[PDB]
Amino acid sequence: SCVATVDDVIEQVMTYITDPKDRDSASLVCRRWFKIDSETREHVTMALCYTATPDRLSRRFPNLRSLKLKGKPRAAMFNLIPENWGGYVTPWVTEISNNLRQLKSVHFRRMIVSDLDLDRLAKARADDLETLKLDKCSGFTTDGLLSIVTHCRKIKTLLMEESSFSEKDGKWLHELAQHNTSLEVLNFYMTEFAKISPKDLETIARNCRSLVSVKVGDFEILELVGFFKAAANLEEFCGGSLNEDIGMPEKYMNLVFPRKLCRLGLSYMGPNEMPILFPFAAQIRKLDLLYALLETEDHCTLIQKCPNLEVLETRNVIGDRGLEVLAQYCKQLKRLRIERGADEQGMEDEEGLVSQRGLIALAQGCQELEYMAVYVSDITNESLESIGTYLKNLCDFRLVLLDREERITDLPLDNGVRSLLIGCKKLRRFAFYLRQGGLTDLGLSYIGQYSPNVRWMLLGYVGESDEGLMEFSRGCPNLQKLEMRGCCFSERAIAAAVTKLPSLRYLWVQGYRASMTGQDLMQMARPYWNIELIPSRREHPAHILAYYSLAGQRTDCPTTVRVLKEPI
Amino acid sequence: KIVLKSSDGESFEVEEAVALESQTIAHMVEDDCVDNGVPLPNVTSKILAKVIEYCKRHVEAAADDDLKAWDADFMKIDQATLFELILAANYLNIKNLLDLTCQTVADMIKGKTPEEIRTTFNIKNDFTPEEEEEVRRENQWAFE
């Protein structure tokens, strides 16, 4: 017996380190520690799939149990990125098929998944695949689905939210009904399915005792009563469809909602059907009024009933008035999102605008907020000051102001932004999209200067000249990903700022002072740094996308995409 | 009451349900060698001592707030000891003790940089700079 070293005990200890950023470190302390991390890492996420070879991954982490790949850039979620752009998943499944023999969970996000490659997935992994997440993907069909539900008989979680595919039939759902037991979560939330029987969804609920969440297409809620009755342990339900004909004023007044149901959002819900929630609103903790059909008043009467609500997502109809209701009724709120509604026929009402008024009201009410994302119609430096004044543990903050309004109160926001970034020092993600005169080179340099923890930034029409970009660039200690559109910055301005940024690994840009040369961008050509240029699909300015990759340049570029490689 | 004979010949009087916390001694009352007392020549006597003190205290859960207290305090020891404990919790089969001794070492890492680590553990970095670069590159550009 010699003295006991750390070496004699590290194999055991490693598996108690969960934090991805601590494994990141542990792997770098020496050769043995690196191997031990390598063989024990369970989950890995690639923010961009083109960032490394699928070979490189399987070599470094032979024993992955869970994997998550992202393809197309965030902009794709706004119909700004060509469909053919990339993110094909096939190289990765043929890698999983051969070298990740341990994988039980797969999550593809904004990628291209084909019928072939998921039949390949299905057959290669079979019963071992507990979870499959097709998050906002395209390129497959119900055949693909039918293939994974017949070969993976033990699927616990299955997800297709916002995916676009070709619907040929419904035998995929029916096959779940007839044979699946293990299902825990089932999600096809933003999806046009027109050939699936609700009877099948009902028989699934009857068979999967562990069924906890389910989100759904445009099913008629009435056809789901059989479901709801059988879905005992159900905690979350988003989706469905509330269709009111006048011939039944009391159509939806006999709804038996599962007892445990505490996270939800019915689609198309009007004021007439809204009442069906009251009998248990004290219990609701998450609300998705995103696709609800109710007006600024109706919002207030409902929010008012949910004191324990800690997450709300809704359109800007919520109104300043609504936000005020939310300010002293739901103190427990942690996440709030306000996507922009119909900005065509006026607003959705005459209170359906949000402004400094509601903002500052909210800042005082819910000081527990950790994520706040708002499409606002008018602001004030003062409002921002109160943000960074009350809700300290804001982690994700996103603000976008609509061009709808003509004159906005006080416009240059330099000093508001400043106290915000200074109070919310827990901030890690930050989005700030304005109108032209919105922020000055001085205010911009504030951002670089007072955002030490921010790793992602989306920036609107900020700055006035290349001065503000360069000033900004000497800051941002931890900035990794940077997206900016609608900017007055020049090609050589960008290029020079990228070199000054210490942490930057991903950059997307739409709108910038170009040049026929194109050679201005070149002055940022590091090694391992790929740059690409784009048009747009679903008058579109050229996009710039650049990212680090230990792979080299992708083979799969569309024709519509150009890769820069020094003097052409 | 059972007798555990330490690594350096040292009998130990311990209760029934105290020595059963180790599924290594539990699975050894079947093929009962408990005749000559359970021999375990791979536990220093100083350590085996600290082990029984842990089990003793947890067994008295028949009668949760003040446990995380005693536990946090029980761990205030030096490294070389902390390690010999993990090795011991794993030489026996005390699942609650490994979840503690290992989680303690794991906390010593959680937060430090690669340098701060091999510092506070005395480990010589043996990466050729190319290796170190590839790993840092994989870590910050590709995976996580």
Add this chain to the structure above:
Amino acid sequence: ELPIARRASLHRFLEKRK
């Protein structure tokens, strides 16, 4: 002229509205 791009999920809903 860079128009505020609408998140696809909503854009789909706003038309299923009318």
